[PDB]
Design goal:
part of a larger assembly, 4 chains, alpha/beta, Rossmann fold, Helicase, Ruva Protein, domain 3, five-stranded parallel beta sheet, 19 helices, globular, binds adenosine-5'-diphosphate, magnesium ion binding (chains A, B, C, D)
Chain lengths: 408, 408, 408, 408
């Protein structure tokens, strides 16, 4: 669908993710290729398959975010499954087809919600005519001057201009309705009333299929957790089982959805792993073939942290400012304030367990717990969060390790 | 929906839970944020997600209560699931999606019950017109004077006024009815019919969805029992598995309910643990990221006990009084009688197994077993529960340990 | 159905698979026999059963391809199942009948898609008459002159000729429609309606059955992994169990599909194995009897690699060129550039894990990652991939072993 | 149904099976007994139950073939299940009722297909009248001389005689049809069209039940694999479990089929085993009682092999000749040619694993792989397969043992 060049894709992706430029270009090549395909002929359109990607890197450094924004950027159906979620089906559990079902149930919960956007002006234009008709019951067979029913639009325009807020005047209209009711009701009873007339069935639900098959993006987290490890063997075939089970999906097959028959042949797959215990080559042969693209993602640095805090559109910091503005409070972060928030986050990840950028949300959130509570009783104030404040609120916590495993 | 400042929320929570102010603050900021979000713009509303909380504290000190009163204070759908439930799914178990289904089913049994409220008034106000139309069959063509019909409001009035109690008189009215059933019964049958035709079936079930999606509150109890421990390895896999399974729910996804397709991106999660064996930093990194808020709850003291006994609204001590009054017995606890009831509870908890505040219920019940039975034959009396009475009924039991593990 | 002599089949297969002539001959005799049978008499048609084949050979050398191109050459339904899948059924697993169900479901999604072909022409040829009948409403009672109607084929012609592109103009036509939707849309909506009423629903699904029963091709991958081994005993039971489970399918039986009752007596089975651990004589005797044909496939050499790279139809090298042309870039591989690409692939397979021809895809993709991204900004250019370019992009990676287990 | 004497049964069975005369008479007594029963009175018809048989012998020597031909000879519903197929249901798997279901789904896939045979002359006689009616639209209310609509049968007989191949003349006829179409279509659209009018529901599906209950034949392979063995105990009750599970079926009970309620009381059961590890007496008491008939089958000899190659009706050799005739090639086997084919088969079974007569299909098939391929380019030739040819094609293979475990 998108006609964006890889470079334009990476650009757009730079608005949400800091660094990880390589994974960006990989994911960008994949998107542009879907365009490149449709510009081909009959034959080559069956042969050319998605160049699936294997993202390699430590926790919370942007693997899923990149895939999520890529998906969101091409208005593509997106699903994220954890590979181990199937390592238990040998005793019972979700079958792997579920992935294509869900990427269909949400690929529908998408086309449906995005049919309320398109059909939101129809019920409040060619449908608000319901109330204005029981306010000024149109002439006994309107005359006909293509401006005759545009004439009132005086007697009419008055009932519309006044319908800019003034209501609660109970009347009635029309299984159509008939029943006597109120406008804060016989108006809202129309909101949905006249809208289901425009949205059909065998096209809306028929298109979800079209979407999944053409633009579906499946993100398989922890693919490395289903590779063979040298600690046992019984659980290995269990793991390797999930690999074989996943095989039909990325090799090309047909799954049964309660919305139709979906073909996975062109669904793009972004697998993901840390690969500390296993290596991509421990993945079965058939899967390595279907995972042509390998891209590495680096661990985040303190500078990466500072940037993540503020650069992304609607960055945690920006959102915080917004939310406090809700309470009528003007919150503001100084450069050194951020530098320390990032510093704290790095400290805890290094002194305890590393969870990547995640750590920033908890640190940032703990730092603000006080303003967040008192916000309402501070309205009309300019609160500045600077190095000082940051230090007074986080030092003790970060400093105390056992406490960090609980509170930070 | 609520417009209560965090501080206002805590106050309303103070009416039910003693102490644990920090946990109140935490849970209150969470609520307030759901409001703060709707005040944002198109973009920032997709970005800002719930600030899930992880409550850390010993058993029976107010964790579930706090959360339950939070949801009950926001008329939000609330589900409490025991995390370990899904451990055995590795062999065969309830899917984790079940959590969002059940959230939905009780969220339906909710919007549906609270539908019987609005349709309980106008449900039997138009239900009268039915029985009256056969006690004073209206004129052949009413005369539009908007008062020429409210005329009986003479003959009519008498039947309505005599229908304020003196009914039970057979009749016949109207798939409508056309049967000949008593008015006590026509009245009853009418409660239904008129009520139902007054309920929008579609919007009903479509609202339960809106609820779960917008105000859903999931309480995952003992999440700490699905963290990794140094005792074995096989369990840890399934243990951690349940974390991976829960992951999509708290990260954002779509589940299939039999009442529709529900999205979890904005359900608020309150996880809970004791954390004596594991530490919050033992949860998988993707989960720690989704639990930005950490709050500890302190163990209850004896003062806490004394207060929990009488201070809350509908406190168990107040409940007992109410229940005894039902029997015509005036029950009164003295300050020392309560100081001693609490004292006893603390004693069994230190003496044997510490079950937190739960212990007050059993001690209090053992103490009243006597009155509770005789109540009826004690009507019109002023029984007083003081230190003497208390000590006479609990001391022997409390002092005897083995007997305590059975009887209290 | 096909009337191709075995030799003709092999030729058509030579267009996609390099070498492995023996396996081609084997699979070609199988097809030819399905014809040879229909030439027999009533009796001899029940007797003669498919000559199932057992392909023996290392990974990624052309086994599945051969079989896939065989079915695709006979427009036959084709399913590929990994035999070990059913191992875990001993604890809980997909039934083996699932193979014939899935064969049927993709065989349905097949006869159904190939229905959209014939109903894509006359589907929108009679779909025009619809839009035209509202641009030139036909006379009140056409005049049977079989040309007096093709008269407009004047006024009519103009709208048809102006409907060859210049449409998008609103209209209204006819559960039919009776709505007022744009012609770009009436046209679209018409594609469906006229197409559907043109599809015999019963014979559709009844044909998928006919297909599976008459031309079904089941490919049971890694059957050798369900043979008995001298390592344990418990698994062997389930292992062999899967053989007993498969037995009725390849011996002749009836399975229940949700689209009807399918019989397997004439599905052709192509089993596959590496057979390093077990030997074909390790399959249970009832199964060896049903696999009358045994053919070995040799490992691929570097010449094989070089050829596989450019020789097939829509070979990956040709595909890349096509894809790059989509970006306006002329890509050309020199003889030595290809000799070196193949060389590299063979090197990683000897150096690390030998994944057969699959390796060409990853090496080729790593090699083009650079061009692939820049393509757009390289439009109108003649990029040439020669030994130099190749060596500059692969040598370092290929030479570094550990890096190969990740990146290639 | 059949009125054949046991001797006539064995005779008819001799047309397909070589040797194994005893198993023949056993299976023949069983069939004749079903006739003997219906010739009895009310009482004795409930009491007399099938004399179930236990066939004892080595692989591929005629156990199933005998049972298959017996079934086929009495047009009885036949099902073959592998006993171990249920030894896994203790962890999950097919329930034993499935056997009676399948023996119903195929016992239906039988009555249905054999309703297309009976109703194949009805649509091409009293239904081809559809096309001849739109070719010569019958008189306005045919007169009536019992030879009046037999009169045309000139104008009529001409349209029928010419309808012996000449068509493709699009017309139309009549949810009946109406729609304009073609004869290679409006003729075929009639083939099934007028035929569903003769076949009813509650008799066709009602009779399948009647069949299974009266003539059902269940063949339970490897019954010995579910007897107790002295290697373990846990899996024993698992095996012995399948015995108990099978008990209701051969003792008399009711199973639920989606076609009706089937009674197994008169289904004939032919169990089968090798009994090398266990003995029939290791079968549980109740099952030995229900398996009154015990018959042994001998291993096949080289002479048995020579005879099997050529005597049976539609013997592999005969079929081969037929199939090559399809290619216009005259294949012919000399007595010594066969003697050697059999010899080779015996050799391999003795030098490696014995798989009985199965071995002949693989040897025979390998021997012909060349003629089978070149058949089309040899048309009009008399190819003789004699001792020489046989030797040149099989010697090397049979001689090389490891190769035989793969290729033969
Ligand atoms: N490079 C990055 N740029 C911006 N945000 C990031 C980055 N890395 C991690 N994050 C933040 O941390 C969280 C971690 O999840 P995610 O980014 O999906 O990575 P992973 O898939 O490795 O866990 C995300 O919510 C995201 O907002
Ligand atoms: N701080 C408290 N204030 C009031 N009641 C409490 C408190 N702590 C415990 N309780 C009582 O004890 C029971 C213990 O359950 P709960 O409060 O859910 O805590 P927990 O989740 O730790 O078990 C509740 O029913 C509640 O009525
Ligand atoms: N002989 C060959 N000719 C052409 N392509 C081949 C050949 N061998 C392997 N390949 C390529 O390598 C991949 C390996 O899969 P496949 O051919 O199914 O063999 P296998 O079943 O042994 O894994 C295929 O996609 C195919 O395009
Ligand atoms: N005595 C025999 N006469 C004719 N064919 C036989 C004989 N024994 C085995 N066969 C052939 O070998 C195959 C082996 O299967 P089957 O005869 O069912 O025996 P079993 O049940 O012991 O495996 C059959 O397809 C059959 O054609």
């Amino acid at each position: 669908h998108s006609e964006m060049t890889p470079r334009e894709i990476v650009s757009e992706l730079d608005k949400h993710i800091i660094g990880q430029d390589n994974a960006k270009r990989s994911v960008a090549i994949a998107l542009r290729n879907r365009w490149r395909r449709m510009q081909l002929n009959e034959e080559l359109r069956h042969e050319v398959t998605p160049k699936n990607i294997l993202m390699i890197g430590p926790t919370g450094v942007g693997k899923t975010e990149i895939a999520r924004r890529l998906a969101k950027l091409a208005n593509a159906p997106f699903i994220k499954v954890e590979a181990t979620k199937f390592t238990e089906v040998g005793y019972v559990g979700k079958e792997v087809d579920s992935i294509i079902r869900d990427l269909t149930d949400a690929a529908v919960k998408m086309v449906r919600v995005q049919a309320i956007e398109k059909n939101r002006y129809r019920a409040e234009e060619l449908a608000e005519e319901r109330i204005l008709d029981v306010l000024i019951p149109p002439a006994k067979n309107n005359w006909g001057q293509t401006e005759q029913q545009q004439e009132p639009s005086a007697a009419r325009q008055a009932f519309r201009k006044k319908l800019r807020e003034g209501q609660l005047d109970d009347k009635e209209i029309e299984k159509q309705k008939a029943r006597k009711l109120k406008i804060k009701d016989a108006m809202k009873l129309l909101i949905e009333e006249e809208a289901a007339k425009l949205v059909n069935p065998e096209e809306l639900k028929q298109d979800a299929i079209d979407a999944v098959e053409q633009h579906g993006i499946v993100f398989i987290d922890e693919i490395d957790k289903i590779c063979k490890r040298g600690e046992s063997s019984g659980p290995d075939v269990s793991r390797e089982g999930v690999q074989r089970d996943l095989l039909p999906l990325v090799e090309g097959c047909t799954v049964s959805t309660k919305h139709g028959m979906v073909k996975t042949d062109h669904i793009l797959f972004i697998a993901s792993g840390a690969f500390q215990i296993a290596k991509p080559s421990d993945l079965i042969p058939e899967l390595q073939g279907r995972l042509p693209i390998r891209v590495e993602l680096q661990a985040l640095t303190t500078s990466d942290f500072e940037r993540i805090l503020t650069e992304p559109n609607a960055s945690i910091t920006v959102q915080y400012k917004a939310l406090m503005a809700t309470e009528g409070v003007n919150i503001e972060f100084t450069d050194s304030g951020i530098k320390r928030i990032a510093e704290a986050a790095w400290q805890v990840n290094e002194s305890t367990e590393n969870i990547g950028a995640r750590r920033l949300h908890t640190v940032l959130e703990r730092l603000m717990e006080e303003i967040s509570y008192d916000a309402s009783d501070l309205s009309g104030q300019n609160i500045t969060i600077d190095a000082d404040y940051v230090s007074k609120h986080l030092d003790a916590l970060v400093a105390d390790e056992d406490l960090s495993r609980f509170i930070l």
